[PDB]
Amino acid sequence: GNAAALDVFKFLSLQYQGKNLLNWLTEDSAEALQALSDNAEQAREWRQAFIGITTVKGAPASHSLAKQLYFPLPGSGYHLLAPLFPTSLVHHVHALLREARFGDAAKAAREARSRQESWPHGFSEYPNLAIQKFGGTKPQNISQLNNERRGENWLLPSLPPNWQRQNVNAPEVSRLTRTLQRFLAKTVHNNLAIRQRRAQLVAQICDEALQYAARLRELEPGWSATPGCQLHDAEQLWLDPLRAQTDETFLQRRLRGDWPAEVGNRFANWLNRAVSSDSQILGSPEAAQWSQELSKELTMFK
Amino acid sequence: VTDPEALLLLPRLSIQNANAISSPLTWGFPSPGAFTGFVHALQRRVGISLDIELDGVGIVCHRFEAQISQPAGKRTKVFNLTRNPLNRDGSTAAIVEEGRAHLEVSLLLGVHGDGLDDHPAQEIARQVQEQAGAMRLAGGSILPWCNERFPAPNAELLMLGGSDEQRRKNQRRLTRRLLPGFALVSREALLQQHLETLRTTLPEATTLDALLDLCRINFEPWQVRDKPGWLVPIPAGYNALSPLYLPGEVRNARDRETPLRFVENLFGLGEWLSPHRVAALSDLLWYHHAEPDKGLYRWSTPRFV
Amino acid sequence: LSTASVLAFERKLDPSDALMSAGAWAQRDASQEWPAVTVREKSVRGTISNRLKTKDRDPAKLDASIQSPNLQTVDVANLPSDADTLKVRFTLRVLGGAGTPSACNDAAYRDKLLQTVATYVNDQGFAELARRYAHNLANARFLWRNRVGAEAVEVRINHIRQGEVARAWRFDALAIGLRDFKADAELDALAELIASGLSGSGHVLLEVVAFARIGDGQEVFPSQELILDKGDKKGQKSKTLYSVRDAAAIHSQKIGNALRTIDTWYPDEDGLGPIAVEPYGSVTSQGKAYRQPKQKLDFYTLLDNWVLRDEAPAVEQQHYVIANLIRGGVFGE
Amino acid sequence: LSTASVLAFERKLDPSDALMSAGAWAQRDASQEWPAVTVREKSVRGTISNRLKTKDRDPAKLDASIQSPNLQTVDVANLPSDADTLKVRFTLRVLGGAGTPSACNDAAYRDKLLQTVATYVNDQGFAELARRYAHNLANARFLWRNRVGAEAVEVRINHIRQGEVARAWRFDALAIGLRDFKADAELDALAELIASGLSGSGHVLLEVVAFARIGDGQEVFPSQELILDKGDKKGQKSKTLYSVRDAAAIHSQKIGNALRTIDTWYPDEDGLGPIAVEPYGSVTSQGKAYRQPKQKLDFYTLLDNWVLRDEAPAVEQQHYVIANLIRGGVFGE
DNA sequence: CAGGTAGACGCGGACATCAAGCCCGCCGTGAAGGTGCAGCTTCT
DNA sequence: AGAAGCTGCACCTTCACGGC
């Protein structure tokens, strides 16, 4: 209402053992004579003027700046659906979980961790809150409960991520393969420079595989039996286990020699099925040649 | 019965001053009610001329940049406002706080009607895009792709237009175009599940959703409890304060031919998945649910799990 | 009879945020590889140069305060030392459907308003209004502080038809002044294009890019962000600039107010200059609000004298009324 | 007629962040591709030079005075060992239209202030002010500590018209003193050009270069950054020199302070020299604030006597008031 | 107008220690409020 | 000499501290 009448609400919220039977003072008999101990006319009139003007409405309206939004009915038609601001006080639950005993739980969390036994109550943090204040300097013009909090609607965030989260979230090799296929598609006199460019392209492909093995050495030392082991037993150990998570030689096939010939074989099978031009079949001796090429460059590590 | 036969993909739209205020309890990304109202306005302006219905819409949000600032000393953030002109006599007017944010979101929406057999292949999508370029999305003007190094086209994929291997191939080539984004999903079964695991001889008022929004770093014999995905609070519709009134009853309405009602916001839980774990892209679409003589003017993503 | 109780009008002539790049003059041809100017935070040391309040104080602490320094931390945007040209670029959508109210209660008021704007566009279409908008795009008025020290400024405007350019304009923004509205050929062509985009026919997308010769290493001004400074140390920094995609830019409303300032018809010495088109026409610079409703020249009284009491205003004031209709707003009783 | 509650004045005489390069003397003419001075972060071993506190006054922990090398981490900027000349380069716009505020509330106060500034500039133009500005540009006062031990300092001022010079001045900066404003023909020409830029009668952007013979491989002093972070140690540098793109530089507000020292009128002992122009005219390094409000010679009382009560001060105080208006800032109730 | 096939590239062992990390001063302000009534003013 | 609308003025009214 008008802020100048807010004084009367400060008269009506006087908790003299009960302010609910004082604002809408209906269940009182002594308070009517206590409001004016002279007669019963002005006492009853003031009592009904106090219980009446706090349960009264007027007329339904929405003065040209309140929001009101069409909602599509299922068959056809609409409703106008004017939203009104609620007085749900999560602000009390926000303030009491950020100042009252957030301090005690936070000090138990922040000086008792060597002590494993801390205090048996937790706390939250509520990050990325947003302050919204309705009345600018004088918030009394809005309402009464907009003066207890000094504005400060305290909005919780939504904020869609950007491919990183703590809760949960989620091509030059193709250029080399394409130019290798387009190179062995056509032939110009079939001389030394063709085999030089073929060795050049397969050299770039296998050092790209070496760079892929090196740049995936930056993930973690210890993997596990994470699923998808249909292609992941020979190339399981080509991506090295960093020799630091082992620490007691828990793996016996790390140096048996099982990995390099099989990794070269399956790499050359991948390059067989990937590079197959109008000269359709590529074949097994070329597979053995590229297999032993990558196998020499993988046993060169030790 | 609201099942699409196509999925018009509108590409990565950029939105310059959205409504970063979403609800009286939540800020950040705009309401999904804005996206359902945008698609219903598109069906009002385009879809009746093609005899097609436009129901359901996705959200990816390729990037988000709110216009906020941190008060230098506090743990919260305040909104960068705008400046309104003087009132009548020369005096700085009372400021209302409007939250504005720059969005970049692509959206796929479910075409439904009989206005496509094989004739409008990619002119129906061109018509919808070139008409939606002159429109706003949440209070934000959709910047319609100025002269740059590349264009960004639209797409129209049919579910019956292709066999099973082509169905999954077209789903894969559709989800490659919106893979850096994050799909927004209504999660109400998860909210009721977390409520009824929370409700062990103790009641609730609204803490079932506030407890999933926060970051509790509590101790159990410090530890920190984890949540699956970004479980955010979202405004999921409205609820009835008032019995609905006749058109010639409420003073100062938007028009005097529609019934008006006084409503409150409703609050639910949403998730920002990545769109490569959706398992059916015929899901992930936001539909209305009136039940209008009860209230409950809800919007959701049904048929999900 | 009675006016509409809810009367809304959407913003036609909607611009976008005006990103700022930096580069050398005469390299305006290859002005797409140009890097943007990034806002920096710098801490400054100054004095207590504000005037003091000698109420419930003592003289010793105040003159000891004005003897002592004053440490602040502001935001600043500079050109590099290898770039004497600022490149301010934005897009502009001319929507269409000018006089249509986006919300109106009374059907009779809606019909009379549509008939009024229909008779206006029939007898005098969007010629003068679009000519003034094309002037305020042609002179670089959207450079607010970036125009006062420029040696030469040039505005390049390109109409994007389908996905590519259809028409190119190149204007010298200093020959076209900020206070006069002349008549040329290319300006009339741009005004006819703006009128065609404003007559409901099309929704014209233009790009505007303005080159400004400021100087090597000089300081440019992106639009300052409004933080109300009522709380715990949220005003210690005193200057925050607007940044979108790691680049300094001007707000949308500032560019709109800059191409909107076309009104040279107010009852207080109209030879001063064009002011922004507002109801109760206000300038925040002079701190005055021209066209007060004590005189009969505000937007509200001219509106419900035009469409309600059937008396048309003067030929210059109905231009201002339709300029508020394009400007958009929330009115009604 | 009273003072407006918001009064903002925009910076005239806008400098840039002055960059520093190093080379050899007598190669001053081809000093375009000179290599820039970089900031080197070094770690020094020292002693305890500060006076002891009451906690370190214990007989056991006066060992910090005895054995503590004090292990600090500072920045430094040195010339190359075969380069004995520091070159400092910046640009300076002077805009004009000094008395017009960019923000006001009372339009009557705005008109009265414009009337007082107008009767000033048609009474006495910007002659003494631009003369003192050109004198502070003449002697390299912007070389702050780079001037106190230099053997010969020479400045070159180029009036950049479009992309080339239009008139070049070349001053021996040591012959022109730092305490008295003498007369010279080239100085009067530069003062007349700065006055023509200060009256809005032209666009004036100058390029100022200054060479100083510090010494072969000596230490030059750029601006030190202010770091607004309070109490912490063992990891704090406490000396961070300012640099743009790995080139040591002087702050723009430092140059703006240095070419503003034109105030030889203050009621204290003026036999020392010119100080900068601030309201309540302060030198916070010297710890004393001249023009205290206990005297009637600060900026605010002289301004509100000149504008409100129509009490015109002396001509020197008029120069001080207009110099504060050229400086800019926030004035008002 | 052409320019190679084959095969393999070592082990061991170790990688410093001492002592300290400054003091002073200060941190802009102006503007961002609604409702209700008393009286004045203008017009009839 | 009585009715409508505008303006001027009064009336209401201050916090708890350290990044999944």
From Swiss-Prot, chain A:
<comment type="function">
    <text>CRISPR (clustered regularly interspaced short palindromic repeat) is an adaptive immune system that provides protection against mobile genetic elements (viruses, transposable elements and conjugative plasmids). CRISPR clusters contain sequences complementary to antecedent mobile elements and target invading nucleic acids. CRISPR clusters are transcribed and processed into CRISPR RNA (crRNA). Cas3 and Cascade participate in CRISPR interference, the third stage of CRISPR immunity (Potential). Involved in crRNA production or stability.</text>
</comment>
<comment type="subunit">
    <text>Interacts directly with Csy2; part of the Csy ribonucleoprotein complex with a probable stoichiometry of Csy1(1),Csy2(1),Csy3(6),Cas6/Csy4(1)-crRNA(1). A Csy3(6),Cas6/Csy4(1)-crRNA(1) subcomplex is also formed.</text>
</comment>
<dbReference type="GO" id="GO:0051607">
    <property type="term" value="P:defense response to virus"/>
</dbReference>
<protein>
    <recommendedName>
        <fullName>CRISPR-associated protein Csy1</fullName>
    </recommendedName>
</protein>
<comment type="similarity">
    <text>Belongs to the CRISPR-associated Csy1 family.</text>
</comment>
<keyword id="KW-0051">Antiviral defense</keyword>
From Swiss-Prot, chain B:
<comment type="subunit">
    <text>Interacts directly with Csy1; part of the Csy ribonucleoprotein complex with a probable stoichiometry of Csy1(1),Csy2(1),Csy3(6),Cas6/Csy4(1)-crRNA(1). A Csy3(6),Cas6/Csy4(1)-crRNA(1) subcomplex is also formed.</text>
</comment>
<comment type="function">
    <text>CRISPR (clustered regularly interspaced short palindromic repeat) is an adaptive immune system that provides protection against mobile genetic elements (viruses, transposable elements and conjugative plasmids). CRISPR clusters contain sequences complementary to antecedent mobile elements and target invading nucleic acids. CRISPR clusters are transcribed and processed into CRISPR RNA (crRNA). Cas3 and Cascade participate in CRISPR interference, the third stage of CRISPR immunity (Potential). Absolutely required for crRNA production or stability.</text>
</comment>
<dbReference type="Pfam" id="PF09614">
    <property type="entry name" value="Cas_Csy2"/>
</dbReference>
<dbReference type="GO" id="GO:0051607">
    <property type="term" value="P:defense response to virus"/>
</dbReference>
<protein>
    <recommendedName>
        <fullName>CRISPR-associated protein Csy2</fullName>
    </recommendedName>
</protein>
<comment type="similarity">
    <text>Belongs to the CRISPR-associated Csy2 family.</text>
</comment>
<keyword id="KW-0051">Antiviral defense</keyword>
<dbReference type="InterPro" id="IPR013398">
    <property type="entry name" value="CRISPR-assoc_prot_Csy2"/>
</dbReference>
From Swiss-Prot, chains C, D:
<comment type="similarity">
    <text>Belongs to the CRISPR-associated Csy3 family.</text>
</comment>
<comment type="function">
    <text>CRISPR (clustered regularly interspaced short palindromic repeat) is an adaptive immune system that provides protection against mobile genetic elements (viruses, transposable elements and conjugative plasmids). CRISPR clusters contain sequences complementary to antecedent mobile elements and target invading nucleic acids. CRISPR clusters are transcribed and processed into CRISPR RNA (crRNA). Cas3 and Cascade participate in CRISPR interference, the third stage of CRISPR immunity (Potential). Involved in crRNA production or stability.</text>
</comment>
<dbReference type="GO" id="GO:0051607">
    <property type="term" value="P:defense response to virus"/>
</dbReference>
<dbReference type="Pfam" id="PF09615">
    <property type="entry name" value="Cas_Csy3"/>
</dbReference>
<protein>
    <recommendedName>
        <fullName>CRISPR-associated protein Csy3</fullName>
    </recommendedName>
</protein>
<dbReference type="InterPro" id="IPR013399">
    <property type="entry name" value="CRISPR-assoc_prot_Csy3"/>
</dbReference>
<comment type="subunit">
    <text>Part of the Csy ribonucleoprotein complex with a probable stoichiometry of Csy1(1),Csy2(1),Csy3(6),Cas6/Csy4(1)-crRNA(1). A Csy3(6),Cas6/Csy4(1)-crRNA(1) subcomplex is also formed.</text>
</comment>
<keyword id="KW-0051">Antiviral defense</keyword>
